[PDB]
Design a protein around this ligand. Sequence first.
Ligand code: PXP
Ligand code: PXP
Ligand code: PXP
Ligand code: PXP
Ligand code: PXP
Ligand code: PXP
Ligand code: PXP
Lengths: 242, 242, 242, 242, 242, 242, 242, 242
Amino acid sequence: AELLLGVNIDHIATLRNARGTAYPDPVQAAFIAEQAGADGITVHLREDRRHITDRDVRILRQTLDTRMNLEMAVTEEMLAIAVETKPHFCCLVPEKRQEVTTEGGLDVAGQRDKMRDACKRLADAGIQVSLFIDADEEQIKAAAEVGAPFIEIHTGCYADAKTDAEQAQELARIAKAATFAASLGLKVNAGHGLTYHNVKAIAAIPEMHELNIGHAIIGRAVMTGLKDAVAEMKRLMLEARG
Amino acid sequence: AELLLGVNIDHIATLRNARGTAYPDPVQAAFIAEQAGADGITVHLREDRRHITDRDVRILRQTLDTRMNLEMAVTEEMLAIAVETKPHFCCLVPEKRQEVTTEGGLDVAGQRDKMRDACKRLADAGIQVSLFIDADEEQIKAAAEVGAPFIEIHTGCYADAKTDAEQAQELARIAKAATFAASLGLKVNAGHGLTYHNVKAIAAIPEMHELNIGHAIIGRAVMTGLKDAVAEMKRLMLEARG
Amino acid sequence: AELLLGVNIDHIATLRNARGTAYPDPVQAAFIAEQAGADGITVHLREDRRHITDRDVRILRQTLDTRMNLEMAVTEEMLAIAVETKPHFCCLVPEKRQEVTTEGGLDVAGQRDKMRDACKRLADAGIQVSLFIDADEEQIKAAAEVGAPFIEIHTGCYADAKTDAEQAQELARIAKAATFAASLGLKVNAGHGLTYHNVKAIAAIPEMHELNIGHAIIGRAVMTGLKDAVAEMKRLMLEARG
Amino acid sequence: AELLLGVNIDHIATLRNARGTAYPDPVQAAFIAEQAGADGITVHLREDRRHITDRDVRILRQTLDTRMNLEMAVTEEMLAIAVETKPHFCCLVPEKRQEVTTEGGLDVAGQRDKMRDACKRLADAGIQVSLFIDADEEQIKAAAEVGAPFIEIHTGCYADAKTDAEQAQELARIAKAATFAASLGLKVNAGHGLTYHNVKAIAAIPEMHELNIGHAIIGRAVMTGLKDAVAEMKRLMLEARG
Amino acid sequence: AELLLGVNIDHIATLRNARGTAYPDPVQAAFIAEQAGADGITVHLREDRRHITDRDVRILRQTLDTRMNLEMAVTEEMLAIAVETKPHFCCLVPEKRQEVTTEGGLDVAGQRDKMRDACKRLADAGIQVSLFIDADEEQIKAAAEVGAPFIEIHTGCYADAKTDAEQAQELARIAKAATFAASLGLKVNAGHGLTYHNVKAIAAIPEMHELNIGHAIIGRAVMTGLKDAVAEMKRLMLEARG
Amino acid sequence: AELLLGVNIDHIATLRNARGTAYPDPVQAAFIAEQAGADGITVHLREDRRHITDRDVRILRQTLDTRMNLEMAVTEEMLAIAVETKPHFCCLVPEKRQEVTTEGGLDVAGQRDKMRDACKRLADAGIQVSLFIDADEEQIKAAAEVGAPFIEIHTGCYADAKTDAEQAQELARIAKAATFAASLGLKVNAGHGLTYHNVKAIAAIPEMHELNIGHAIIGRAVMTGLKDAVAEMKRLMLEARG
Amino acid sequence: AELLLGVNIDHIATLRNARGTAYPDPVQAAFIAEQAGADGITVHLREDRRHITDRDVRILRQTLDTRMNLEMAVTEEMLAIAVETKPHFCCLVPEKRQEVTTEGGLDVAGQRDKMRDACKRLADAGIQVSLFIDADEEQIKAAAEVGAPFIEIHTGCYADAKTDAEQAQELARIAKAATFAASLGLKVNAGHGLTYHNVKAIAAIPEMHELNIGHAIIGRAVMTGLKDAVAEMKRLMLEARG
Amino acid sequence: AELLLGVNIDHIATLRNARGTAYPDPVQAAFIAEQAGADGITVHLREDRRHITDRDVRILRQTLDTRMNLEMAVTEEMLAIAVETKPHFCCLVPEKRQEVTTEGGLDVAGQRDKMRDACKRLADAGIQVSLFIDADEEQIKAAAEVGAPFIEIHTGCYADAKTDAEQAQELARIAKAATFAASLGLKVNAGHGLTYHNVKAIAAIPEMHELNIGHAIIGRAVMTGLKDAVAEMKRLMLEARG
Ligand code: PXP
Ligand code: PXP
Ligand code: PXP
Ligand code: PXP
Ligand code: PXP
Ligand code: PXP
Ligand code: PXP
């Protein structure tokens, strides 16, 4: 099967929420992405509704032609929204109310019960769960044990590497983590900080199932337009695999 | 002489600052806009460097092929920077820091002395001053008496009008204010809230020298790309005048 | 006051409804059209929901950046839906459950009580009413007398003209009818059967406020794409006025 | 031997037939498609001529630069039309006058005499026959036994799969069925319900000769234009094979 | 009314007829032209079928969305074909079997009876006749007297002018001829040798109803593509009139 | 090494020569093609200067950025011009003057001495010689014995095959001939009649060095423009080899 | 009638001559420009052949579809080249210190016999002569006295104005000089330093016959490509006259 | 893994410096290239600042989203600039006669102490150093001996080959030199004179890390625009490795 691309459109909403106006509309962006290389659309419903809103989730759930990947913190509010929304995928992330963006991976190994119940609860509601974690063997083994079918490896450290060596070290760390996760029966994704110049090495990793990318695509889109921004990212991804 | 377009690129920076990375870069957005219909580039340096930064102003000042319109609050920090930067145009606006955007016009009539000096100060630097004000005769007479070459009428109320009637009222108000301003020897600009659907009626106002538009252009841009977004806005404006 | 274009996206749904699938989605078409020259989006909620559905109307009302023009028959059902949806505009038309399309013109002059009540009811909910009528001064006088602020002249006979002379005659007739309409205080729109080759003569009529075009645009769109189809239509319309 | 694409333009006519007008014209669509990646054009001449008409078939047979694949039910009428038109390919399908679309699969195993005669008759006129069947080895063995050189596996159950597991199962089933088909000397096509997101798994099946896709392409076309819609589909198909 | 453009597609056929292949097909070119600025499609059925064939006329007559302008010599063969074909317009030209192209205008003043019967015969068959003639008062008066509703002034001499003065003289000669023709009640067209650099002066002439252009459009199309080639010619024409 | 594309621009001239004007100009068409996938430009100087002229060869020789492939008949006039012009490649073909195009291959086996000298003569000028021949071993052995570096297999019969079977026969014949030619140390090219739909099977033949294609490319060009036409042909060829 | 644009392609050669290679080729740039809004092509053959070369001139003279405007210094070498070349226009420019004014134009009032001689000589050969001069009444009287039919006003000072005031002044001086020149029977062009942002004010001057623009267009072309850069400039010019 | 492309934007500055103006601006060309396939940007800061200037370097260092490859001659001025500039890469090149070999590369084997010194010094500052040298074993041993981590092979001879044979020879010599260089622990780049038609053979060499290309891309850009020129070059490179 081919490498999939999940396009995170949160930042379309962050441009909108800077004013009280309704544009640009994430609902439009999703249609564009889905027709230009996206295999899924991702939204992170933050507790503070900083960008994506309940209104967005609600309409997107009815308009997406592919499937929704709902990113959210593991809280009662979100599990409840998640269960009612029935998104195809749900990606559990850690979240501070005023963090710049998603900081690190979930602390699964240190909250086994909490994650186990959440996975169970989402799974009963027919949602395929993905735990966003660091390329960390302990967290990976834990994710598998709490029952999650997917993990999504945080590519931030790789993305922020300051030197070519630091970068190669993070790459290898991620590739090995991915291999270990698959050996435990997990399906594995990756995301955060992926760009047009750093994505191919990540996409070359065989175990990768889907990459979730947002900011870099939206950043290219304001110059170039979303359609091309997405098509270009999807092109580079398949090139790395061929 | 033709109606001019000033593109505000603040929101390119908004998108960039949502994260710690450097893209999208306001410097790229300016080249694009200048080559697609913009006659000048506007940047608003907020006290809280929310979006546009000193870095941005410093490089932009060296890369713009047209000219800078520096929107700023009337404070000593800003006046010093302006005198220092020598932007072709300077647009004085009220500011609070935690504001969603620039609300209404400047209280010029109520601070004649403070405005009188800033105008003289900036003009001695060879900068052309624009006072962002409400479509209010008291304020226009003030701006005139104080010596500012330009005023920029706030189109916010017109943009937010809730009914067709309310819109029409706000329009006639801006149109009558523009004629009045012109009769006092002021050159008049307009801006804030202008979109692809409400710009023409404002562009048709004879006295209008330049319209400063930002958010609606960036909003169209994440869908179509900055180039077409700017070219479209400019096309609508020239059509209005024709 | 620029000639406006209202894009009827009914036929996007005509294509969607031929199968059980959900694409093409009217919601996407609306965003494209509103950004390519459409000043308003029009949908005909038929008694038989052959294309636009309650879902489309419910979501469109939330995603439209411009304004909805709800075409509907005068029935208790429709009037209830309209009062609740609160479209910006509402266009009342004659409906025969099994018709190929709107055959043409409401009999207002013979149902003044019915139309009078409909108009008031919709106006009470804040909806600007448009009575779809033939280029007939008796019908027009009636529309004015019943209180509708708008009328839309049926351009179908003009569109189906079999000879250049028949066409010329229906043009003159539409033109005289529109001038009469305006002298009564009515705002006048026109629609049905307009094409890329017959639209200019109608757009040239000075009294025209908005043209409502659907089928020709969708027919061009499957070939060239909605964006260019809408833009071309709007371009020809503005050329006619110049 | 490259995977071929057969573009079914039935739905261009679906849009044309909603009115009395003659556009969009299937004849134009055919030229566009044949020049954008289509290797053959497909039309379904329905008993009720709801879309493609005798005119379309008569003109298409003269304007096609590639080859026609006539989809039709097995009736004396159709067989007579086919013998006279002499399409390069003919695809026999089950037809119920009022169906939404081809429901799926001919019952060949239970009408061997009928199908045997049809196949011979068409082959006598030089037409290469294709029996549209379900991924069913009994039906497939029969198609081979009756003398048809081609079969087209119905991909509808796979397209309408409600769960990833159901989908995976219909894929495996289509795949095993195709391999069995080939071992019998049959050439195997596939069609119905294929989309931009579900086409690769089908295109990857090595035995596949030509995919016949219609609705998804037209649905994308109203948005982006036929040319790009066909090209995108063909591009994804060739990527799956590589 | 706006200046119309009749696109002559003969040369699409001349490229085709250089081989025994069927491409490029005039039928495709006509659809493109008609959707890119053409108001009518012109074909010259030559006695030697050098480019356009009976097959072309026959299919075009069924596919054109606008109307056909049949150019032909005044011979029994053509009058008969013309009457059976019932094209909207028929343009009578003089013709040698092996001339490079149409050489000059019809000799109407010297074949009054012949032209009178031909006009009559075509007119009974409901065809609007146009006599292609030189910008010559005697020929123009004659055309009017023999009954033709249209004349088409040969722009060849203007097109071939060797010097700027020779050119200005031909321009004036054509403008005066056009004025004289209109004064006699004739509707007037122009064509032959019109290019992207010489068309505007011709289009600026008020009496001009439709320009018929071929070679230059096809010559640009091989580089640029027909759509743009036509749109560009149509753009220049309307510019000259505004 | 990759499969090369040689674009024959003769038919650009065909279109130009249909009239007395200078457009379209082969010189423009060459720049376009060289920048869109062509690795060389081919021009066939016919004795009757039907399309390409001495002017064309003289300027082209100075403007080509890649290299010229001069197709000519084996006559003294031509040999002299070739020796004079110094084209990188020279392709010897049979010619009659009133022929629709180049029919079959050169009779090399039957004129060994004449061909032996032309080859030696041209090679002494530093020109690489290609003998246009039929996929016939007798001719290939002849071309080998005579000293020509290259042979170009005539793909005409393959292009004209009337049935799928006949096509397959012609293909295997060209494929086996190419391998044979290669085994005798000849470099092999192919051409004549290659289209967008039959090129791949020929491109896939391993031994093929360069395919010379003209008419189908010019034919696509009047619709889409030379650039896309060439780029498309080249894309299909590289796909075949991959 | 129509304001004309002459594109100076000198800097195409400037980029080519930076190396020993032949690309980019001015011959190609000329075809692009002539089909994108250029009404003529300008090349300045410098004595030192810094950019444009003898071959450029020789070949361009055979490939231009419009006309050549040969720019040259007044020497015997150039007069003989121009006489032999027969360009349509010749623009005499200063190339040495003993030829220019303190501003940049050709010193005509100081070389009256030389110019009188060049003018008469070029004219005998059928070349229309333009004298490149300053917006200077003395030089203009001189040009009129000497026999030149055209003058081309140097817009450099205007283009280099450092302040708005300074710019308005130079504009004025050019406009006045244009009116003055016209009153003496001279046709007048303008050029040097014209850009996308300063051209409209110059285009609006009514007496302007043609604007000669080079560097800004090529400067834009490296980013957007020559076609759009030329088209855009022409569009801006026509907007200025509407 | 992926072959990389470094775009040299020197000639953007070459076109700008031909005048006193600031356009075209290298800062813009860099954003375009980095988003169109460039993996790095190269600027050669010449002692004479013929094209790239100090401001270019200073600003580019702050705007590049990828990395800078500073090309410079080995002098104290440049070493200090590079040390202070901290570009990611530095490519040492000959700028004076007493620095080059008879071919074009830097004479390392003849200035071993100087290079050993530059290499060590740049390295201490974190700059990866590349020595631009000939496909010469002696210079390569020297570069290895001296400590440089990279060499960039001069492809000029290969690019200027006058005959196919001559070209195959230089290709071979480059390939051998690449393998040899790699065997000594050096990473290797290539560049100078690479074009759209000669790059694939160089890209196919496995040891190649990055190709540095400038003039051909800018040469193409003036025609097609920088974005497509960069994209096209990158596409050709990747095709070569597939
Ligand atoms: C779990 C997860 N995956 C992917 C992303 C996408 O990150 P980026 O916007 O950096 O591409 C995010 C950012 O919210 C995330 O939180
Ligand atoms: C202070 C200020 N902010 C922003 C803008 C532009 O705002 P908007 O983004 O709505 O066009 C203007 C121009 O009126 C302005 O003066
Ligand atoms: C009242 C009215 N106006 C305009 C239209 C649009 O018509 P068309 O699809 O013919 O463009 C319709 C569709 O029936 C309509 O009912
Ligand atoms: C009567 C007539 N009008 C117009 C044309 C178009 O001429 P051109 O191909 O030169 O544009 C022709 C050429 O056949 C013609 O004969
Ligand atoms: C003599 C000759 N003519 C024409 C061509 C190209 O022909 P076509 O136009 O069919 O590609 C070739 C290349 O085979 C050729 O050798
Ligand atoms: C006489 C003349 N006119 C116009 C131009 C065009 O100047 P620019 O390249 O500045 O647009 C030039 C420069 O070659 C010139 O010499
Ligand atoms: C060391 C080096 N590499 C690569 C290049 C690129 O050369 P070209 O401009 O010929 O593509 C240059 C020329 O600046 C160079 O000096």
